[PDB]
Amino acid sequence: MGHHHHHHSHMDKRLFLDPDTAIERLQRLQQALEMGVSSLMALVTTDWRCYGYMERHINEIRTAVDKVELFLKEYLHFVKGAVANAACLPELILHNKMKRELQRVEDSHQILSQTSHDLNECSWSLNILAINKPQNKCDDLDRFVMVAKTVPDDAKQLTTTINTNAEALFRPGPGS
């Protein structure tokens, strides 16, 4: 019950820590991601049709984008390590289940980066973002928003899966 001793493992292509400890670690990342997404939601409280409002948040929205990408990247950095340990399981079945759901979280992260990077190459010019055309299915700016706000839910799938099978993924040693 509640034992922490994460040491010796430091730059492995994986992560060895207590099953109890791994749960809180992943929980903190889940909430941290939601805080980053919330930051974006606070800045995006209306449609882009409002140049006046958008221009007054054009700088800080970039940081929020960076936050969503940041927490999501650090989240992947952790869960990928867990999936690495899942490869040491006798069944291996869990390893397939925990990765398939993860492929949605990565699928979001990649398109998020593609849009963010492209907007950055557009120098975040208000002419392209705030003065954007009403008819645009290639609305990468808005796509980032709708996807970023679903990421915490799709990630929550992995969060719960790993946490519930934590005792199977992470073995702290025999206890007789």
The pair of three-digit structure tokens given for residue 39, joined into one six-digit string: 């930051």
Give 136's Cβ-side CA count (13 Å radius).
15
> Cβ(43)–Cβ(59) under 8 Å?
no
DSSP summary character for residue 11: S
Residue type, position 23, single letter: I
CATH number for the region 1-176 comes to 1.20.120.830
Spatial neighbors of 62 by CB under 8 A, at least 6 apart, are 120, 124
H helix or E strand, kind and range, residue 157:
helix 151-164
By what technique were these coordinates determined? NMR
Using alpha carbons only, what angle is made at residue 161 by residues 155 and 165, rounded to the nearest 5 degrees?
150
Q: Rounded distance, CA 151 to CA 165, Å?
A: 21
Q: Rounded distance, CA 158 to CA 166, Å?
A: 11
Query: In the chain, where are the structural domains located?
Result: 1-176
Whole-Å CA distances, 42 to 45, 65, 101: 6, 12, 28
